[PDB]
């Protein structure tokens, strides 16, 4: 039917491709009287919003509104929901503040957003934390609402988990902080990874405080949702370089593809409802002077171009494109992870450090440690295929296994390690308080000088890929020449086995 499409001005988006994006497209056009009106608007105030709505609803009875925001105001989606409630016109949130997740839609509304729920996004963030083995965490929230369902979903997920998520309790803030009483709440944090759920300026103030509190370290990770970030074309100040964000503002899922998918959903709903009822165009007359066959109760399971763009009861995409990004060393947001219907397709199995989160950060504690497979000391087992998590009395590790014998390609399969020296490594990590990155050696055994080239754990220490050799290792003169041992902790000489 008659569909209005208005967008912002960001992402180098002109208007002529919006003219050419409806015409030759929609090859399977089942309704007859379908037309589009593509407009733009610099003003993002609700005055101009109500003005353009009353100009386009009377503008030859437009049955569908497509709005795209470029700013970072979450109340614009609330105003669009109010417009969809008053005018009974299906409105699709596309970009910016129009695409931001609001709290509770009306059941008598027709407004829908192209965004994931807070529960699916918390599931993605806990999938990140499970795949990267960051188990002890906390939660800092302000009085900016939507946090109660978030805390409830986190508690029900931890109660329904086989990981064993240790968690210091949720830190709440009272008011606009004087840095007097909320600082006592922030000093309670002694964990590594902190989850932050608040608005944008509140996130700027809290991250500036954590910079002043020294909570932006190498071990101190911050994972924020899309409500913190807002938009990818504007990256503000006082974000640590390595800030993990989960959003969906991708250039790959571009704004032209956004409005094309929106037109596809609208025409699919109108065409599949046209086979049920005849008089599908039934629009509101005017804004002045004061319905059963509606498209709201119909598109629960809608699919265009093979893309599962089905809509939930609360107005969410069932399988959207969740994008996990980080802040690089050059103040940009690099795309790291994409999300399937069930799994999270990651790019870096080993977590990249992003060492300079800020300027003054001496980070000399990411100690790379190699170890060797032995039966009484380093028990190396597969991860549990039913839970995809090492049991908490073990440590994670990786092994570089070459799949194909033809070339030197290989993969870092993550496995579990336990035993005697693993307990030594854990007690050193809990006494000296250092981070450790453990991996198996792939070149072979302990090591031997062959053609004046060391290998094994000795070679990994000498060629500086391994900081220390925690795994089981003997001591002779040549090793004490080429490396330096610690004190001996177990009396292990040679011995003869007989029957």
């Amino acid at each position: 039917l008659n569909i209005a499409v208005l967008l912002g001005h960001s992402h180098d988006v002109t208007e002529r491709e919006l003219r050419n994006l409806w015409g030759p497209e929609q090859a399977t056009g089942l309704p007859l009287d379908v037309n589009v009106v593509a407009l733009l608007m610099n003003r993002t105030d609700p005055k101009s919003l109500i003005t353009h709505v009353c100009d386009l609803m009377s503008g030859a009875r437009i049955h569908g509104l497509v709005f795209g925001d470029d700013t970072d105001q979450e109340a614009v989606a609330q105003m669009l929901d109010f417009i969809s409630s008053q005018t009974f016109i299906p409105i699709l949130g596309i970009h910016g503040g129009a695409s931001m997740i609001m709290a509770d839609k009306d059941p008598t509304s027709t407004f829908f957003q192209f965004g994931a729920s807070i529960q699916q996004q918390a599931t993605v963030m806990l999938k990140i934390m499970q795949d990267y083995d960051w188990h002890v965490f906390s939660l800092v929230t302000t009085i900016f609402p939507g946090y109660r369902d978030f805390i409830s979903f986190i508690k029900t997920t931890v109660d329904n988990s086989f990981v064993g998520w240790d968690m210091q309790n949720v830190i709440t803030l009272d008011t606009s902080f004087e840095d007097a009483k909320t600082q006592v709440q922030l000093k309670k944090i002694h964990s590594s990874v902190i989850l932050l759920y608040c608005s944008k300026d509140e996130a700027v103030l809290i991250l500036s405080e954590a910079r002043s509190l020294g909570l932006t370290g190498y071990d101190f990770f911050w994972i924020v949702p899309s409500l913190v970030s807002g938009n990818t074309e504007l990256i503000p100040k006082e974000f640590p370089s390595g800030l993990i964000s989960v959003s969906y503002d991708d250039w790959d899922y571009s704004l032209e593809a956004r409005v094309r998918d929106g037109l596809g959903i609208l025409t699919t709903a109108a065409s599949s409802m046209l086979e049920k009822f005849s008089y599908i165009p039934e629009a509101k007359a005017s804004c002045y002077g004061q319905p059963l066959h509606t498209l709201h109760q119909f598109m629960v399971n809608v699919t265009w171009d093979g893309k599962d763009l089905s809509f939930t009861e609360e107005g969410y995409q069932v399988h959207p494109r969740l994008v996990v990004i980080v802040l690089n060393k050059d103040r940009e947001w690099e795309k790291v992870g994409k999300w399937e219907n069930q799994t999270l397709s990651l790019r870096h199995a080993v977590w990249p450090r992003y060492k300079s989160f800020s300027d003054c950060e001496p980070d000399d504690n990411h100690l790379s440690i190699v170890t060797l497979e032995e039966a009484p000391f380093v028990i190396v087992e597969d991860i549990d295929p039913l839970t995809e998590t090492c049991v908490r009395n073990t440590v994670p590790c990786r092994k570089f296994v070459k799949i194909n014998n033809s070339t030197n390609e290989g993969m870092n399969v993550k496995k579990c390690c336990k035993g005697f020296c693993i307990d030594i490594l854990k007690k050193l990590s809990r006494t000296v308080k250092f981070t450790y990155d453990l991996y198996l050696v792939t070149n072979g055994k302990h090591g031997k000088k062959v053609n004046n080239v060391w290998n094994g754990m000795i070679g990994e220490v000498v060629y500086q890929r391994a900081v220390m050799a925690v795994g089981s290792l003997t001591i002779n003169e040549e090793r004490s020449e080429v490396v330096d041992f610690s004190v001996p902790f177990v009396e292990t000489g040679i011995s003869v086995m007989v029957s």
Binding site: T44, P46, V53, T175, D201, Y288, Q290, V391
Partner: protein, 658 residues
């Protein structure tokens, strides 16, 4: 020097009194050159044009706080959402004066919304004070709506956190139906009689007509409603003698207009004390810059402490509502709402008006039926609960002990086997033994009768996952207790953390731990400290009963995960299956409580227990939540501990060796 203040009201004399009170407040608060102008906007049938008038009239006028002031709206829309949604774009604090809705109580959609009237959630505070004063314990939540009822139940549980008591029956359903007599009939057969109603006017009229059809106007019915239940024909359909609450001068408009003046003017003078003086811009040409002192001036509105007020001392809470909720307690006395209560916030003061009740006396005590029938569930364990079919039909065998004592049996109700094993064979059978005699002693000590049934499946009950929402639900005896199918678990309940995380317990009657039953040359295994069990094999077959406390205790200890990898191979349903397996050498070890294995070692000479005792726990009576049987039964069990009654129960089955 002038500042336009937005008012949303029709009748112009209210704005005249508003300007008069604002001028009086500006006269007595310094010689600063500020002026406060007022702008009025009126009724429109179309909310789009309401939002149009608000945006093209007030935002360009540089308003600071817009007042929701439409009480007498004849339409059933009740939408000041144009005002709130327009002023939320610039974080302007919207002040409400008219309604008490939960959609405005939530800060989620309406961010900076404060108001001078507390919502219907503080009726739960008043009713909690009524339960504290007039000794009421159990309630019934009857909500015909769905939206406000969730927040009402959340505030109800937040206020009942001090007692940790909950409602026996909470209800949420679709309005506009007339077939709720089934739900009222199911609420009739319960024990609580304090009924809480919170719905619309027509929904209240419908449920009052349904209660009149089910003649719930009799004695013992404790009705306690708000103000939406005494309006219209719901006032007529209400029973004569129902207790409600009413706004003290809430419908009187100029009182809270003057209260809003006394808040807003001195809040402006408090905002002019400190720095960061920002103003909302003229939102006409692209003026979408956020007002940075939104939360700051909101905090000025939150910490607003005054003494003036016709209704009383106005003060705002930490939730944007009104502290110290005070309401008139009304009674429908012969088709007349009579003010039978003038409320002080800490104690209730009834006046000299007689409270005519539909039931009996003029007082309002607790109304219950003292739980005359208690459903009791147990599980099949022979040294604790012997379960046998009857002799001919219902009657039991008059069995005599070694001292001529007739065994005091009970007619339990049990199935033949599980649902795959037995399609439908569930009969009243005979049950007796240890815990049965304990239950008979408790039923003789305290003054109540009971009912004994059996568990459906063959499990104790663990917090196991369910398909939808990936939620860990319950099953077994706990799954039958929490579903209301049982009233008090009298069974060998191994007390641990997770079972006590949800329900409360009693003091244990039996104190023992865990041990191993084996078959007995070096034929010894000797308890948990065997490294042959630490590193198992294919011939050391050890397992446990499926979904028991043994699996919970060996699942918490992750260093015992290896046994957790083994016991899943041969999990059984009942312990007698494990006894028959270990007697025929199908099982090589079995982790179990000490009493049953020592009893079977007394019965059978080939079955030999070990001595390494671990996880010294207690068998306690599985109890409910906050309930009037937690203290009396515990004192009765401790009275059984102090004398030799537990010695006599040992002399029945436990102590005697064979």
């Amino acid at each position: 020097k002038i500042v336009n203040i937005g008012a949303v009201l029709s009748t112009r004399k209210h704005e005249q009194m508003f300007r008069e009170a604002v001028n009086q407040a500006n006269k007595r608060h310094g010689s600063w050159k500020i002026q406060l102008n007022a702008t009025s906007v009126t009724h429109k049938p179309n909310a789009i044009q309401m939002a149009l008038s608000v945006c093209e009239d007030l935002i360009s006028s540089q308003v600071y706080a817009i007042l929701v002031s439409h009480p007498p709206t004849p339409n059933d829309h009740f939408t000041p959402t144009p005002v709130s949604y327009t002023a939320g774009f610039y974080r302007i604090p919207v002040l409400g004066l008219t309604t008490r809705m939960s959609i405005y109580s939530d800060k989620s959609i309406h961010l900076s919304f404060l108001r001078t009237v507390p919502p219907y959630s503080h009726q739960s505070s008043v009713w909690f004070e009524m339960m504290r004063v007039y000794n009421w314990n159990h309630i019934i939540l009857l909500v015909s709506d769905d939206h406000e009822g969730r927040a009402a139940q959340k505030r109800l549980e937040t206020l009942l956190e001090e007692r940790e008591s909950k409602a026996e029956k909470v209800l949420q359903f679709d309005p506009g139906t007339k077939n709720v007599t089934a739900l009222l009939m199911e609420a009739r057969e319960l024990e609580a009689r304090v009924i809480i109603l919170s719905a619309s006017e027509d929904d209240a009229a419908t449920v009052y007509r349904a209660a009149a059809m089910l003649n719930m106007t009799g004695s013992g019915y404790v009705w306690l409603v708000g103000e939406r239940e005494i309006s219209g024909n719901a006032l007529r359909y209400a029973p004569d003698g129902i207790i409600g609450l009413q706004l003290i001068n809430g419908k009187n408009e100029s009182a809270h207009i003057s209260d809003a003046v006394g808040v807003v003017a001195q809040a402006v003078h408090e905002l002019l004390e400190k720095e960061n003086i920002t103003d909302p811009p003229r939102g006409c040409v692209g003026n979408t810059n956020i007002w940075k002192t939104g939360p700051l001036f909101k905090r000025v509105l939150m910490s607003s402490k005054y003494a003036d007020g016709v209704t009383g001392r106005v003060e705002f809470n930490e939730d944007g509502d009104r502290k110290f909720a005070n309401y008139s307690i009304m009674n429908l006395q012969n088709r007349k709402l009579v003010q039978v209560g003038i409320y002080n916030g800490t104690h209730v003061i009834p006046n000299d008006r007689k409270i005519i009740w539909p039931g009996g006396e003029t007082e309002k005590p607790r109304g219950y039926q003292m739980s005359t029938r208690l459903k009791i569930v147990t599980i099949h364990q022979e040294p604790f609960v012997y379960v046998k079919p009857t002799m001919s039909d219902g009657t039991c065998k008059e069995e005599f002990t070694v001292n001529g004592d007739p065994v005091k049996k009970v007619i339990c109700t049990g199935p033949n086997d599980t649902s795959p094993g037995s399609p439908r064979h569930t009969v009243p059978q005979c049950c007796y033994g240890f815990c049965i005699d304990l239950l008979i002693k408790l039923a003789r000590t305290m003054n109540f009768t009971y009912e004994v049934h059996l568990v459906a499946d063959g499990k104790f009950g663990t917090q196991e996952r369910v398909n939808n929402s990936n939620k860990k639900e319950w099953n077994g005896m706990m799954g039958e207790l929490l579903s209301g199918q049982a009233d008090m678990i009298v069974a060998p309940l191994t007390i641990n953390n997770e079972r006590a995380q949800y329900i409360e317990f009693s003091k244990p009657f039996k104190y023992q731990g865990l041990t191993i039953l084996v078959k007995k040359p070096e034929e010894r295994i000797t308890g948990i400290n065997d490294p042959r069990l630490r590193n198992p094999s294919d011939k050391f077959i050890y397992a446990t009963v499926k979904q028991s406390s043994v699996d919970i205790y060996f699942r918490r200890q992750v260093e015992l995960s290896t046994m957790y990898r083994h016991m899943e191979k041969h999990n059984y349903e009942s312990a007698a299956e494990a006894i028959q397996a270990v007697r025929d050498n199908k099982l090589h070890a079995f982790i179990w409580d000490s009493a049953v294995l020592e009893f079977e070692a007394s019965q059978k000479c080939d079955l030999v227990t070990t001595g390494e005792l671990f996880f010294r726990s207690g068998f306690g009576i599985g109890m409910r939540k906050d309930s009037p049987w937690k203290q009396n039964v515990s004192l009765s069990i401790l009275k059984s501990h102090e004398n030799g009654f537990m010695e006599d129960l040992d002399k029945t089955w436990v102590r005697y060796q064979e």
